[PDB]
Each structure stands twice: as C-alpha cells, then as structure tokens.
Enzyme design. Structure first.
Site, mmCIF file in Angstrom:
data_model
loop_
_atom_site.group_PDB
_atom_site.id
_atom_site.type_symbol
_atom_site.label_atom_id
_atom_site.label_comp_id
_atom_site.label_asym_id
_atom_site.label_seq_id
_atom_site.Cartn_x
_atom_site.Cartn_y
_atom_site.Cartn_z
ATOM 1 N N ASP A 1 78.698 19.092 -11.070
ATOM 2 C CA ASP A 1 78.648 19.833 -9.807
ATOM 3 C C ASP A 1 78.164 18.945 -8.660
ATOM 4 O OD1 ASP A 1 75.925 19.587 -10.322
ATOM 5 O OD2 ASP A 1 75.649 21.689 -10.872
ATOM 6 N N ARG B 1 77.141 18.447 -3.328
ATOM 7 C CA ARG B 1 76.760 19.420 -4.362
ATOM 8 C C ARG B 1 77.628 20.662 -4.150
ATOM 9 N NH1 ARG B 1 75.608 22.904 -7.666
ATOM 10 N NH2 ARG B 1 73.568 23.244 -8.699
ATOM 11 N N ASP C 1 76.182 26.216 -11.015
ATOM 12 C CA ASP C 1 75.280 25.332 -11.734
ATOM 13 C C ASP C 1 75.947 24.936 -13.070
ATOM 14 O OD1 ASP C 1 72.794 23.914 -12.155
ATOM 15 O OD2 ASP C 1 71.945 25.641 -13.157
ATOM 16 N N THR C 2 76.320 23.664 -13.199
ATOM 17 C CA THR C 2 76.755 23.110 -14.486
ATOM 18 C C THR C 2 75.530 22.623 -15.277
ATOM 19 O OG1 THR C 2 77.169 20.995 -13.317
ATOM 20 C CG2 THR C 2 79.081 22.425 -13.704
ATOM 21 N N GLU D 1 73.165 19.928 -17.223
ATOM 22 C CA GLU D 1 72.946 18.497 -16.978
ATOM 23 C C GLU D 1 73.692 17.696 -18.053
ATOM 24 O OE1 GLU D 1 71.504 17.114 -14.309
ATOM 25 O OE2 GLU D 1 71.346 19.173 -13.542
ATOM 26 N N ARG E 1 72.329 16.089 0.285
ATOM 27 C CA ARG E 1 73.663 16.335 -0.311
ATOM 28 C C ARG E 1 74.451 17.319 0.543
ATOM 29 N NH1 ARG E 1 72.154 17.893 -6.429
ATOM 30 N NH2 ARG E 1 71.316 19.637 -5.181
HETATM 31 C C1 LIG Z 1 73.547 24.372 -4.888
HETATM 32 C C2 LIG Z 1 72.368 24.252 -3.964
HETATM 33 C C3 LIG Z 1 71.248 23.568 -4.420
HETATM 34 N N1 LIG Z 1 70.163 23.330 -3.579
HETATM 35 C C4 LIG Z 1 68.863 22.924 -4.150
HETATM 36 C C5 LIG Z 1 68.060 23.984 -4.891
HETATM 37 C C6 LIG Z 1 67.413 23.207 -6.021
HETATM 38 O O1 LIG Z 1 66.151 22.669 -5.550
HETATM 39 P P1 LIG Z 1 65.115 21.957 -6.585
HETATM 40 O O2 LIG Z 1 65.656 20.558 -6.812
HETATM 41 O O3 LIG Z 1 63.816 22.033 -5.852
HETATM 42 O O4 LIG Z 1 65.185 22.788 -7.852
HETATM 43 C C7 LIG Z 1 68.411 22.070 -6.279
HETATM 44 C C8 LIG Z 1 69.447 22.360 -7.347
HETATM 45 O O5 LIG Z 1 70.357 21.271 -7.445
HETATM 46 P P2 LIG Z 1 70.777 20.752 -8.903
HETATM 47 O O6 LIG Z 1 71.297 22.006 -9.617
HETATM 48 O O7 LIG Z 1 71.792 19.697 -8.570
HETATM 49 O O8 LIG Z 1 69.510 20.215 -9.480
HETATM 50 O O9 LIG Z 1 69.157 21.923 -5.081
HETATM 51 C C9 LIG Z 1 70.145 23.995 -2.338
HETATM 52 O O10 LIG Z 1 69.127 23.849 -1.633
HETATM 53 N N2 LIG Z 1 71.226 24.622 -1.850
HETATM 54 C C10 LIG Z 1 72.322 24.831 -2.594
HETATM 55 O O11 LIG Z 1 73.275 25.464 -2.104
HETATM 56 CA CA LIG Z 2 73.250 21.190 -12.229
#
Ligand SMILES: Cc1cn([C@H]2C[C@H](OP(=O)(O)O)[C@@H](COP(=O)(O)O)O2)c(=O)[nH]c1=O
Ligand SMILES: [Ca+2]
Length: 129
Positions: free
Chosen positions: A15, A29, A34-35, A37, A75
């Site tokens: 993702d 992103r 959510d995929t 890891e 991202r």
């Molecule tokens: C998909 C997405 C993730 N993010 C943030 C929330 C999560 O924060 P934290 O890192 O504090 O958990 C993280 C999840 O991304 P990943 O699923 O790539 O880890 O990215 C956003 O802020 N907005 C979004 O739309």
């Molecule tokens: Ca992920």
C-alpha cells in the site's frame, strides 16, 4: 475528483509505492486501505499483487481526495490507478487489504471499497480465509 498522470519509480509494498508526480519523486500511501506488512501473513502476496499491477500498467494515475494530500510522514495520499483500474479497490476485492484509516474528508471511495471487502469476505479470499 480528478485523475492525474504519474509514472512508476519503484514498487515498495502492498500500500506504498514510489512514483514521479509533477516531475518529483514521492512515496505514495494508498487511501482507505491497510495491507499486511511484508513480514506478516499475506504481506508478501499484497506486495506482489501491487508490484505486478503497477509494473504491468502502461498508464499510472494519481487521484487525490478532497482533504489532506500529504500525511505526517510526507507520503502522498491518493487513489492510484493502473490502466484505469483502481489499485486500492483491487487490493480490497482480492482480500489482500482491509478497508482502514477512513478519515473525514478523504473518504470519497469508502463505500465502493467496503462493497469490495464485503465480496472478498463472502468469498473468504486471502486475509478472510
Ligand atoms: C492511510 C493513511 C495513513 N496515515 C497514517 C496513520 C498511521 O499513523 P502511525 O504511523 O502513527 O500509526 C500511519 C499508517 O500507515 P501505515 O499503514 O503505512 O503504517 O499513517 C494517515 O495519516 N492518513 C492516511 O490516510
Ligand atoms: Ca500497511
């Protein structure tokens, strides 16, 4: 919402992906998903599905939603299409991602994706098996 051009720089995982957008390298992103890891169950399958879908596309497009276009890690946040087909939806429809991180104002395609997840779960695909 509008589709905008970009080109694949490198697949990263289920993702995230490195794309060139408006002439600049940028990690994206995928919105609303959510995929697992890479080191988790179905994580290598997610990565592989996204890599092939993009590497085979003749045309990649980025589609921002109404709200935040960049997350706290810098991202890009978007719906990503490969030859007109949405990668985010395709991940969910195959049971390779869950609908997730649905934040107000960046949720245009939430219901489309929830309907894909419903079908994935009905078929007990992948994560739902
Ligand atoms: C998909 C997405 C993730 N993010 C943030 C929330 C999560 O924060 P934290 O890192 O504090 O958990 C993280 C999840 O991304 P990943 O699923 O790539 O880890 O990215 C956003 O802020 N907005 C979004 O739309
Ligand atoms: Ca992920």
């Amino acid at each position: 919402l509008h589709k905008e051009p970009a080109t694949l720089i490198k697949a990263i995982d289920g993702d995230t992906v490195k794309l060139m957008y408006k002439g600049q390298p940028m990690t994206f992103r995928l919105l609303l998903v959510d995929t697992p890891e890479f080191n988790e169950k179905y994580g290598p399958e997610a990565s592989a599905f996204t890599k092939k879908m993009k590497e085979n596309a003749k045309k990649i497009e980025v589609e921002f939603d109404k709200g935040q276009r960049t997350d706290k890690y810098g991202r890009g946040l978007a719906y990503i299409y490969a030859d007109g087909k949405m990668v985010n939806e395709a991940l969910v429809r195959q049971g390779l991602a869950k609908v997730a991180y649905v934040y107000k104002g960046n949720n245009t395609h939430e219901q489309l994706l929830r309907k894909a997840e419903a079908q994935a779960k009905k078929e007990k695909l992948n994560i739902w098996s």
